[PDB]
Each structure stands twice: as structure tokens, then as C-alpha cells.
From a paper:
To determine the molecular basis for binding of [name] RBM-A to [name], in the wider context of the whole RBD, we co-crystallized a complex of PrimPol480–560 bound to RPA70NE7R. Surprisingly, model building and density refinement revealed that [name] bound to [name] residues 546–560 rather than RMB-A. An excellent fit to the high-resolution (1.28 Å) electron density is evident for amino acids 548–556, despite residues 480–547 not being visible in the area of contiguous electron density. As [name]'s RBD lacks significant secondary structure or globular fold, and residues 480–547 are not tethered to [name] in the lattice, we expect that these residues remain flexible in the crystal and this disorder inhibits their resolution. Like RBM-A, RBM-B has a low pI (pI=3.25) but this motif contains two adjacent Asp-Glu motifs instead of the typical di-Asp motif, not previously identified in the [name] binding motifs of other [name] partner proteins.
Evidence is accumulating that suggests the primary role of [name] in vivo is to reprime DNA replication downstream of DNA damage lesions and secondary structures.
Numbering used by the authors:
A (entry chain A): 0 to 120
B (entry chain X): 0 to 8
Write the structure that this text describes.
């Protein structure tokens, strides 16, 4: 029951209740760089709580070494210890990951867990 | 879904 390892319902809680006290366990589905200019690179993530995916996660730049040294990568399972929500002028919300711990490496997990569907914001 | 040019603003 691999989905029992993920905080099912955390994405809805973040995006509907603005709950930032939870420390949810999520799976990275994908990571890619965001287009940037003359600045530190920035990374965006598609994350899963087992029920939903959400593509609006951004890594704080202080966490860039986790991506660049390949510890945070697609399929890994991580616990979010500190995050903030930012709401854009157009109404869409971005979740900025400030502190996280990788609980299980991508190589130890190996696959997308469950069948999460995109969150309807 | 949010484009790169808007996600960082």
C-alpha cells in the first residue's frame, strides 16, 4: 500500500485552507528549471500527495544544491518542513518549499506512487 | 500550468 506513505489530502489542505503548519510527505513526480536570466537558477516541481498532483511548487534557491547534486529527483519521497504560499495577481497560487527532507531516494522508490490526478485549482 | 514568466513574480 505504497500510497499510505504519502500525506493524502495535503495538497487540497494547502490550496483550500492555506494550512502551513502541516509537515506533509509528498512524492516528487518531476523537476525542471524555470526560465531565468542573470540570476541563480530556479526549479519548479510537480508533486504528488497520492491523490492529487500539483505543478505549482517552487524550490527556494537555498535548496538548489539538493537538485543539482541529485538527492532531490523524480520519484523521491520527501517531507516538507517549511513552506509558504504566494498568490499571484491572476489568482493562482505558488507553493514555495523552504525546508524539506528526502525520506527515500528516487532509486529506492523507483516509480510514481498510486494514481494521483491533477488538482483542480 | 503557471508559465515560468508568471510563477516567479
Amino acid at each position: 500500500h505504497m500510497v499510505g506513505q504519502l500525506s493524502r489530502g495535503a495538497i487540497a489542505a494547502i490550496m483550500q485552507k492555506g494550512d502551513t503548519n502541516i509537515k506533509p510527505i509528498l512524492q516528487v513526480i518531476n523537476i525542471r528549471p524555470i526560465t531565468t536570466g542573470n540570476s541563480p537558477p530556479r526549479y519548479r516541481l510537480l508533486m504528488s500527495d497520492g491523490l492529487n498532483t500539483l505543478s505549482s511548487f517552487m524550490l527556494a534557491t537555498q535548496l538548489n544544491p539538493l537538485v543539482e547534486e541529485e538527492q532531490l529527483s523524480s520519484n523521491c519521497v520527501c517531507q516538507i518542513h517549511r513552506f509558504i504560499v504566494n498568490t499571484l495577481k491572476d489568482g493562482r497560487r505558488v507553493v514555495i518549499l523552504m525546508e524539506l527532507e528526502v525520506l527515500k531516494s528516487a532509486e529506492a522508490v523507483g516509480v510514481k506512487i498510486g494514481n494521483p490526478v491533477p488538482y483542480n485549482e | 500550468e503557471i508559465p515560468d514568466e508568471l510563477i516567479i513574480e
